[PDB]
Design a binder for this molecule. Structure first.
Ligand SMILES: Nc1ncnc2c1ncn2[C@@H]1O[C@H](COP(=O)(O)O)[C@@H](O)[C@H]1OP(=O)(O)O
Ligand SMILES: Nc1ncnc2c1ncn2[C@@H]1O[C@H](COP(=O)(O)O)[C@@H](O)[C@H]1OP(=O)(O)O
Ligand SMILES: NC(=O)c1ccc[n+]([C@@H]2O[C@H](COP(=O)(O)O)[C@@H](O)[C@H]2O)c1
Ligand SMILES: NC(=O)c1ccc[n+]([C@@H]2O[C@H](COP(=O)(O)O)[C@@H](O)[C@H]2O)c1
Ligand SMILES: [Mg+2]
Ligand SMILES: [Mg+2]
Lengths: 415, 415
């Protein structure tokens, strides 16, 4: 029997013609998250409620509905229930949802719960914006030069989870097929050898890049950079790059700049020329440090996006306050992007900034831009005030140390 | 007919019991390299000759022997000769060799020449040390905290080059085998889909990690960190990590620290405890910025090593002076790690620091540590003097701009 309680007051968000219809009293499912989820999620709920109350003068209000995945799900639904079918149904039904960090168990042969949510719900965009908040302690000299938006492909690549263990019957069978039927001679050591499969498709690539370009247009961004290791992986990463450029030409009027390969796409709303370009992935990890100002919207495959979003977050001092969304055509799931940090769980200590800024993305996604703007303003003021959680405080002089809950209040105080 | 000229004076380095036997007059093959190879290679030859002359008072001298690969090879050997069989034979025969950057052609369906050299010669270690040279302009606040040595696996991973183009007969055949014979259901879009194969073996992993641990022992380093994305790629990256820890236990007496998973390995020469630990790859790209001092020797797979070595080089301001070696059991090939930068080729402008420091690694590999130490000392003094090439000069105030050749001389001046 379901243990989810549908709020008495509240209405379901609906979707018509690829446009969300958000009532004044939307029901929003949330997953508390494991470990420090118990600390950051309540802070998020309070900050969001305050921003919504202030922005719309009580006309609008979210009806929060708790749903389950992770350790807490096992405590609620029983022994091996880490991801209840109901959770997939409810996120799809209610269209917009948010989650804290999740514990995926080890030793039971089950794969990342975050990835499972993304794939099962076909949330093919992992959207991770990375900007600098003035006053944040950073390991780099000029973090203010970083203002990028990562569109990470979320449904394919080596994340597909297709692989077989060394010495297993399945692995030997695949290896035999490769060597004997496909004539593969490039496996250096075919014995005691694990094998993984990396898929990349035209449809998967183009839906991701299409979203990135539409985002650059909608937000008057300066460029979209396709990041790939296509010089080594010609038919996956290289194909991603080629299909991305092709999509720009075929759907957005992209035209050759000089002798190429970069293209220009005209923003149909502002007339601005958006540059479509590409950078090889290893070099890109250098470029984001050395020439951050030259980059804006990034479009890349699953694994590369994983790496890039972490590297960027670190450089702006944002390891614990990096927002993230997982967006598909039918629903969207916003998430804390850090781990469960169980050593601090329940101590009201850690930074709720990541889940709060993912909630900012959520409000913006709902078209509640005024409430979203208040969170940004609040976050900016609290950090500028040097009234911060231990993770910032320990890197600064003259800061005031706040608990997790207290930092949530500081954000509200600065709205 | 071979166009290589074996130096009249000079003797072949030999290998006995896994130990190099280097004569006083060793013949060393070198590949000039394409593009800026014409600039940096002569600088390297002069600096190396000076260090060798100064260190051993004329008793020792390298007999340089030019050999070919890349664009220049086509000019020498003819039309489609990008990598002559002779070059593979000569590097193996002469045991130690060095190369500038290489041009791999596009449109002819041939794969990276650098990777081809590594795989054909079974140079399974890509060795990339990253340290800071005082006075180098860096984008980070504390580059001096970075002093790491990357052991990047060089013979397997997705670098194997096993892949098939979307819509090709081969791809469709592999996909059919996967879905129909292996029961694979995780391919999101099986049509118009490129496919790549990622192998990781026990033997490939252990020979790489074995070298990393022997290096930590030989050089009294503090730790070896296995970097991997094993939480998603369980049977390749995860297997790499597990096999690495296992090798530490089985061959080096590694013992559990506390409740694990980190191990301690006792240095049999100094008694120092070497920590064996692991970090997930995305988090590691954050850790090298935020806690660089905690890391030392790194052991990782091919693609991860590609990314990590670039990210580290950038942060120490070393994008154009990063040294690199490719080492196997029978021979070794040292390399400039930057590209061919054809826009500047022949202008005597670019930084020869990368190929010079790879030559430092080469001298050290030969047991000519005194000559190697002189190059390090020279490089340190020239940079400290602010007498540098344009790539450093443009980021500094009060520097003296030197040509490529002139920076080579500055290094010698500071020996
Ligand atoms: N919201 C947060 N605020 C502060 N630190 C965080 C946050 N999230 C993660 N961390 C850091 O990441 C670690 C948790 O890692 P994980 O959950 O991935 O296993 C914590 O130890 C903490 O670093 P630290 O212990 O140095 O203070
Ligand atoms: N040894 C070097 N010294 C200075 N810059 C270098 C060096 N090697 C590469 N570069 C930079 O990399 C580029 C060459 O890229 P590639 O060979 O990978 O296609 C050059 O434009 C240059 O940057 P820049 O043009 O900004 O001065
Ligand atoms: N118009 C273009 O397509 C364009 C412009 C600038 C840089 N690039 C890219 O940057 C690299 C070097 O460019 P530069 O001409 O700025 O040195 C090349 O690999 C090129 O692909 C392309
Ligand atoms: N003795 C050990 O094995 C050891 C020590 C320190 C950190 N770690 C690793 O670091 C992470 C957190 O460690 P802390 O106990 O320092 O917070 C854990 O994932 C753990 O694997 C392990
Ligand atoms: Mg990640
Ligand atoms: Mg590289």
């Amino acid at each position: 029997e379901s243990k989810v309680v549908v709020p008495a007051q509240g209405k379901k968000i609906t979707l018509q013609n690829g446009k969300l219809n958000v009532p004044e009293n939307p029901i929003i499912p949330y997953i508390e998250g494991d470990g420090i989820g118990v600390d950051v999620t309540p802070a998020m709920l309070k900050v969001v409620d305050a921003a919504v109350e202030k922005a719309y003068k009580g006309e609008r209000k979210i009806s929060w509905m708790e749903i389950y995945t992770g350790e807490k799900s096992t405590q609620v639904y029983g022994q091996d229930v880490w991801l209840p079918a109901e959770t997939l149904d409810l996120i799809r039904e209610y269209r917009v949802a948010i989650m804290g960090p999740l514990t995926t168990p080890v030793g039971g042969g089950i794969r990342s719960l975050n990835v499972a949510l993304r794939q099962e719900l076909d949330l093919y965009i992992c959207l991770r914006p990375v900007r600098y908040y003035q006053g944040t302690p950073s390991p780099v000299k000029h973090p203010e030069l970083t203002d990028m938006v990562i569109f990470r492909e979320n449904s394919e690549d080596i994340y597909a989870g297709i692989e077989w263990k060394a010495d297993s019957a399945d692995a030997e069978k695949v290896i035999k097929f490769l060597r004997e039927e496909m004539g593969v001679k490039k496996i250096r050591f075919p014995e005691h050898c694990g094998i993984g499969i990396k898929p990349c498709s035209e449809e998967g690539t183009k839906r991701l890049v299409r979203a990135a370009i539409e985002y650059a247009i909608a937000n008057d961004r300066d460029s979209v950079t396709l990041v790939h290791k296509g010089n080594i992986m010609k038919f996956t990463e290289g194909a991603f790059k080629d299909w991305g450029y092709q999509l720009a030409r075929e759907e957005f009027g992209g035209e050759l700049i000089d002798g190429g390969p970069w293209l220009k796409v005209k923003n149909p709303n502002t007339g601005k020329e958006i540059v479509i370009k590409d950078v090889i992935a290893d070099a890109f990890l250098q470029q984001i440090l050395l020439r951050p100002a030259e980059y804006d919207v990034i479009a890349c495959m699953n694994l590369n996006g994983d790496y890039i979003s972490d590297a960027l977050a670190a450089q702006v001092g944002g390891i614990g306050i990096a927002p993230g969304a997982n967006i598909g055509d039918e629903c969207a799931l916003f998430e804390a992007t850090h781990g469960t940090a169980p050593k601090y769980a329940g101590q009201d200590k850690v930074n709720p900034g990541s889940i709060i800024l993912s909630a900012e993305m959520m409000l913006r996604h709902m078209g509640w831009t005024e409430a979203a703007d208040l969170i940004v303003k609040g976050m900016e003021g609290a950090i500028n005030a040097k009234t911060v959680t231990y993770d910032f405080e320990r890197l600064m002089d003259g800061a005031k140390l706040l608990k997790c809950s207290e930092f949530g209040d500081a954000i509200i105080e600065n709205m």
